[model samples]
Target: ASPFRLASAGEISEVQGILRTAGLLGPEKRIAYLGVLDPARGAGSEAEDRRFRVFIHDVSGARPQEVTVSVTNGTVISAVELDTAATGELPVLEEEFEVVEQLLATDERWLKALAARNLDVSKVRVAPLSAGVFEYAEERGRRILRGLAFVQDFPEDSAWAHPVDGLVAYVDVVSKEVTRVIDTGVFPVPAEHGNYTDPELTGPLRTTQKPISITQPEGPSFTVTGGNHIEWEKWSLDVGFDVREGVVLHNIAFRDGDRLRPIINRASIAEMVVPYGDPSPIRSWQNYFDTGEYLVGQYANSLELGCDCLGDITYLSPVISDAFGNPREIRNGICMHEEDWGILAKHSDLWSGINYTRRNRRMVISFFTTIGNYDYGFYWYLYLDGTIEFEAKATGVVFTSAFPEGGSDNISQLAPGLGAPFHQHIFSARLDMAIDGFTNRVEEEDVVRQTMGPGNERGNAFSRKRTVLTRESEAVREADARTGRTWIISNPESKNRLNEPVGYKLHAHNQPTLLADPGSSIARRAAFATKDLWVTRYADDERYPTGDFVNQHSGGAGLPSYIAQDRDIDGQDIVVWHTFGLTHFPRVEDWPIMPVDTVGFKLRPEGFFDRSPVLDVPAN
Candidate 1:
């Protein structure tokens, strides 16, 4: 546990060399590198830890092996193989890992069947099919690669406007041949020659603006401690990257006077469910688990200096490995910065005419991932008032398909026919609470109307209900518009000056949970989205809300499966899994490029602080 340090690029290279020397990596016997991080072992001092855990897949053997390696002080402690079962780890999929170019290559060389269907391979767009079909193929002892097709006009503007309905092509990635074609037999081209004809804003419609700058006259106050660890004012946390979840923050704490208090041990987006609402034969099976199926971090956009980020920023690079055991670095994968958040507090006296105000400063860490037609920006911000916000900003083109109903009041379209269909962007974040220490309890607080007597005599009164969730079976909760509901993570032993248990209040913005049927494929696989909030006891093996190997997975793995055991969760180390998402019934305005839609939640200090924590914050 050497300072919770992420393995350096050099250290990663050394591990790869060692694995290769042991004949664990090669063309015929290659490995799929999973991750490299401190295993969180209780060794060494909190400020001085040196142990690391490297996860990889030994794909060379007949039966693929999940390899876990332990390293300390530059020497390998042990390398053991675990059961090849899926957890939050990404699966080594050949069809998916084989870049789009490879899929395009396969289409060009052996798309005779598509040609027979009057679909020119040259004038068509191709992408990997959902993992469900792939799973079916694997179960039948076959290496089949399925893909969707989008026919385009002679000159394609927005190929999404030209979907080849009812058509799916299956290919054998290993044999390099077209296996068979599935004709859903519902050809309904909703476009005029399938060429995009939406309004392309120009001239004054797209106006330019002057530059807005943020300069720190005294330079940045925050400083880097151990690699990715950051300390700003009273806040400190370590930021890391996951190939699937994008940004991961750990060891988040706040310094209260001379004491540094623990807030959360870990926090990260657990899973994302983007399920289409279209029930047509061509698109019914379009639900996608972006994190588990596609691996968002692999597609993380390299943040630019003055473009994607602003203010005084610190750039962090990540070294990632592909399914083939090949390694590369995302130069500017993650960005961190400090910003002035207006005023923290202000007070003035009329008689004295003297004003007292303190500026608010916050540290933000962020990263972006382009998941096909949609772009997702994951952000985490820490404020001086002990508030931690987790947010997702979605801005990109909508995934469109050809529909028959042209723009008409008679037809209610998420997007008009010749437009896109409706879909949702649902995400889950897991918080391993370590408030004050490790042992913590979860409680639900609701503001409701008083039902009877005394305070309710006016027939217009309110009361609050506080419920202590004692077990896993009683902890599943949801947002109620009628009664404002909030969750509390409290430390039983640590009390504030008022003798109340110190805790953090977890609250969410008005957001919708998944509306998919509980028995549907999407709801089954992404059971984490069934509710808005979940409280589970900590388990080392439970990382992803949607289980581990989600590709081509049906159900019975994720949160729903985890909660089946219903373990007692009172006053022990606990984890909270909260879901945030929006149902996008797309409008015409969302065509070319959708406006940025955002959803977020925050963990604010409840009784954790004696009073206003930033009352004495220094003026900038």
Candidate 2:
């Protein structure tokens, strides 16, 4: 199934030839590859193992031609044709970024703004601004990229360690024009690299910890089929990507002895927002829709072997477009491997003075993407005990603005002379459960205080309440750990041996709700971050939490728009969207490279199995 791998440079040419042979490619037509969609797993073995799909589009015509080319053994098996408009533009390419840089450097207006700050235009560094949004992008019928300027204050400092704050530039991506400029009259700061990177600062605290290693004397245990399809002890899934969602998992399931159980239909990290707290023109209005603003897969960093992951690993290449709208493969764009997870279970027989223990193992599939100064790492885990963990880690420079001439305090000073603003990293995830087959129900579980009457209960006792969400209105919930509130997806007909319904519990860490004032500009722009959980009836067009078209959006889109229908969700196909975040008030330790801030949620089997799901796992 090597054909299932990314389309090679030669494969791209072959795909083009197949289209030309079908008279689908011509000079007047503008073509771009949307993505290679993996075909549905067919009814049986051979049909499922073979036929790979490539989704291509000729978006220029009044009516676009959507072509699906099926390839096998380096030959065209068949081509399916349709007349439909394109979904969206292909992801931004490196060349578009070059156009951004060229426009910024050549504009006289941009140059004069720099000169006015007592800063030479040649010495300043510029890149696409990370946190600002264009409120007019939709009306203009194209995307606009924003840029921020900076300068190095110390002799050997990183540009991020200093700031030329309050100056912003905007460029129309299609025409390469510096369309707008904004300056807040705030002056730049002169902060040095100080203790951030130099040995002089961290030298006193540096030390070597005890060594640790995970060795599999018997070697790794896993098999990869069809390139992207991975199979470990009891779980299986295939990896995919979208312009907005950087990583997506398809057909996730767990094998239960003789029966293959359907767990999740599809899963992904849907949307993320990093909203800032400062009121300056640059930092105040800096709430960003990271996935929607700029696609993450287009900027996915090449993962290194030993550094990114250890032990034996397999890399999957992804075919993405270049600036000219031609497809090319990026090798090692995705990494998959197996790792030791310490321990799963242990037991003891005190009378006999004997103990039995089993080590835990997990399969990790991961990718990393950097949006401006912050690098975000995503991990999908498959554990031995039928558990799936979706995790996010942030490790990179803290976005900083220029402080006043003499301000030095922890609240704003992540580093000297640099004002670190308050911010939150909110992540939303989409989970589609087909557990024990399609029709699933969502119920909210809450721990309530007892009214001490019938049971004559102690005042400190608690009670549990389960509410079935019959409609979308009751599906949206905020995470509350004190109340033991949790959402479970279950099948009414599928019950375990103990006569309890089978399900998977979705759990998340408690994160603050949007602290931005009610109906504020930032709040209206990112209403998806206001709650932590949402359940909606399944729809093909409803994939993103902030709506598909989030760029330049004012409001009235995303989850709020989806829930307006208030559709019946009881015993129907459903989707669960969970949002979690960290409210970061900057401290000095977060200065140079902020320590990795992590937020995660997991799907665990509740009553899905009769006994320990991984009881058959071989002991190490």
* Highest TM-score against the true fold, candidate: 1
lDDT of each: 0.71, 0.71
Candidate 1 TM-score to native: 0.88
Residue-level lDDT of model 1, residues 1-620, one tens digit each, is 33455546665566566666665556654443366553553544445424334445433334344544443344555665544333333343533444433565455433554655676666776766554532343333223446666666666455666666567666544445566666656555555432234444332343477778887777788898667888888888888776767778888999999999999999999788788777765566777777777778878889998889987778888877655545668888898888888888888999999999899878889999887677999989898889999889998877766555435321234443555667788988999999998879998989976666775776787778889899888888888866888888999988999999999998887587887777787777778887889988888778888776675565768687777778878788899999989888777776667788889899999989999988777765
Model 2 residue 333 distance off true place after TM-score fit, in angstroms = 2.4
* Candidate 1 residue pairs in backbone clash: 1-49, 1-50, 2-49, 2-50, 3-49, 87-548, 88-548
Model 2 worst lDDT window (10 residues): 83-92
